From a paper:
α-adrenergic receptors (αARs) are G protein-coupled receptors that regulate vital functions of the cardiovascular and nervous systems. Adrenergic receptors (ARs), or adrenoceptors, are aminergic G protein-coupled receptors (GPCRs) subdivided into nine distinct subtypes in humans,2—three α1ARs (α1A, α1B, α1D), three α2ARs (α2A, α2B, α2C), and three βARs (β1, β2, β3). Upon activation by the endogenous catecholamines epinephrine and norepinephrine, ARs mediate a large variety of physiological functions, many of which are of considerable clinical relevance. Here, we report the crystal structure of human α1BAR bound to the inverse agonist (+)-cyclazosin, enabled by the fusion to a DARPin crystallization chaperone.
The stabilizing mutations locked the receptor in a signaling-inactive state, as evidenced by the lack of agonist-induced Gq signaling compared to wild-type α1BAR. The result was an anisotropy-corrected dataset extending to 2.87 Å despite low completeness and poor data collection statistics in the highest resolution shell. Helix 8 has been replaced by the DARPin D12 fusion. ECL2 is tethered to the extracellular tip of TM3 through the conserved disulfide bridge between C19545.50 and C1183.25, forming a partial lid on the (+)-cyclazosin binding site. (+)-Cyclazosin adopts an inverted L-shaped binding mode in α1BARXTAL. The dimethoxyquinazoline moiety inserts deeply into the binding pocket, occupying the orthosteric binding site (OBS), i.e., the site that accommodates the endogenous agonists epinephrine and norepinephrine. The cis-decahydroquinoxaline moiety of (+)-cyclazosin, composed of a piperazine and a fused cyclohexane ring, is accommodated at the boundary between the OBS and a secondary binding pocket defined by TM3 and ECL2. Finally, the two distinct conformations adopted by the furan-2-yl-methanone moiety are accommodated in secondary binding pockets proximal to the extracellular surface. (+)-Cyclazosin can be thus considered a “bitopic” ligand that fills simultaneously both the OBS and secondary binding pockets. Our findings now reveal that residues A/L3.29 and L/Y6.55 are important determinants of selectivity between α1ARs and α2ARs.
Author numbering: 38 to 237, 248, 284 to 319, 324 to 524
The structure:
């Protein structure tokens, strides 16, 4: 029994990973939509409800599961087992009925690319969410009233098992009937996305991108919960109590997968072909192509294998037109590569005054430092880009900024015999003494 020690850490790390994504991850998903007015979209309305269901499990289902394993058989069915039988179904029924609202929203979204925005608003989204909880409560808390008094002979309050009238009636209303709607709708979405993808406004690639991310979510839920919900009806015609325990735990694990799916899935950058196409267009300075590619569904914030985005390479290669349209198409102006360089670092290096001003105008980090601690002022001062050094200082660039090698933008100007820049950087440093000078 030497493995008993190693099993603790392995399970503990997996349970720690779960809690992290399931509680913190979901709260962060909720807060991102809650504190951004531009992110309050009907699709984002359903994922907040999906995160609320995962959160509601963690606080009202897992405590009962944790209390069982830790303390043992303090399993007082009359109350204890009735609450976290009821709460368990409620959360699961809420989750799958939310995925029904998603599966339908995504068919309305994919099929009707330019019609959807008007069709589905915040008002129509709240009603769909409202319905889910009204149904979910009836489906979950129904049986707890319908079957009021405990059975004679063979009661199983504190067991997943029961008679066929519950095993089928519950599993139908809580899984299979919802599953039918989902699979039928995401089967319909499946073929429309190919039919319009073969045939082919960016709207289709914004909503077929959305349909793909959420399709993974829908699949991972089905994959997680099918094993349990296969075994409840199938038992009536099998599994030990210890078998049911891991099948439920598998279902619970899904609560952490959603935040992970949103961090781990590339679908906006799913078109590896269309993604690397834009990265090249923006670098080569091909305004016609970049505009066309963006309009055809190309991700503005595509990450290179090194970490460079189209805005990086555009700022580097000195293509002002592409920098403007990228920003105009919602480009991360403070995008970082592996060493932390932003497009302003690159614009500063290659001496493009036009782009440095445009980046700053669009809210670029003037003092943004890379892993070495090198700021855009370090690079502009190093190569003799005096116009950029002045623009940078004007936007409040820090002259005292130091890299890992202890070198400051002034030092680099001196060490490259840049007399003009060194004077402007030395003057800039005595700014605090010009409180006395009016
Ligand atoms: C996700 O959907 C469902 C979840 C459900 N969860 C329970 N639980 C949760 C905890 N259980 C066990 O751990 C467990 C281990 C072995 C048998 O049960 C049992 C036993 C203790 C009391 C609550 C029970 N009971 C249901 N009847 C149930 C029904 C569901 O849909 C039809």
């Amino acid at each position: 029994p030497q493995l008993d020690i190693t099993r603790a850490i392995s399970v503990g790390l997996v349970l720690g990973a779960f809690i992290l994504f399931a509680i913190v991850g979901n709260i962060l998903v909720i807060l991102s939509v809650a504190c951004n007015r531009h992110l309050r979209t009907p699709t984002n309305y359903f994922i907040v409800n999906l995160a609320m269901a995962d959160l509601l499990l963690c606080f009202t289902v897992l405590p009962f599961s944790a209390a069982l394993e830790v303390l043992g058989y303090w399993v007082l069915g009359r109350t204890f087992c009735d609450i976290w039988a009821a709460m368990d179904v409620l959360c699961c029924t809420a989750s799958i009925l939310s995925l029904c609202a998603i599966s339908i929203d995504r068919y309305i979204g994919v099929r009707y690319y330019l019609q959807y925005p008007t069709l589905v608003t915040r008002r129509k989204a709240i009603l769909a969410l409202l319905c889910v909880w009204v149904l979910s409560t009836v489906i979950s808390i129904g049986p707890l009233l319908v079957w009021k008094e405990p059975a004679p002979n063979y009661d199983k309050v504190c067991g997943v098992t029961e008679e066929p009238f519950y095993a089928l009636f519950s599993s139908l209303g809580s899984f299979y009937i919802p599953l039918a709607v989902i699979l039928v709708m995401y089967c319909r979405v499946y073929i429309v996305a190919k039919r319009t993808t073969k045939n082919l406004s960016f709207k289709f690639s914004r909503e077929k991108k959305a349909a793909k991310m959420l399709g993974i979510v829908v699949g991972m839920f089905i994959l997680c919960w099918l094993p349990f919900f296969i075994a409840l009806p199938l038992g009536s015609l099998k599994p030990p109590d210890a078998v049911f325990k891991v099948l439920l735990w598998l279902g619970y694990f899904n609560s952490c997968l959603n935040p992970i799916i949103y961090l781990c899935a590339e679908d906006l950058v799913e078109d590896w072909e269309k993604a690397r196409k834009l990265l090249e267009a923006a670098r080569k300075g091909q305004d016609d192509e970049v505009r066309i590619l963006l309009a055809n569904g190309a991700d503005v914030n595509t990450a290179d294998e090194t970490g460079f985005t189209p805005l990086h390479l555009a700022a580097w290669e000195g293509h002002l037109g592409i920098v403007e349209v990228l920003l105009k198409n919602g480009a991360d102006v403070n995008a970082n590569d592996e060493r932390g360089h932003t497009p302003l670092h690159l614009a500063a290096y290659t001496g493009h005054l036009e782009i440095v001003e445009v980046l700053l105008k669009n809210g670029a980090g003037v003092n943004a430092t890379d892993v070495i601690g090198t700021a855009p002022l370090h690079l502009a001062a190093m190569w003799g880009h005096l116009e950029i050094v002045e623009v940078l200082l004007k936007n409040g660039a820090d002259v005292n900024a130091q890299d890992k090698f202890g070198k400051t933008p002034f030092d680099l100007a001196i060490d490259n015999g840049n007399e003009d820049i060194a004077e402007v950087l030395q003057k800039a440093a005595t700014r605090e003494l010009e409180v006395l000078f009016q």
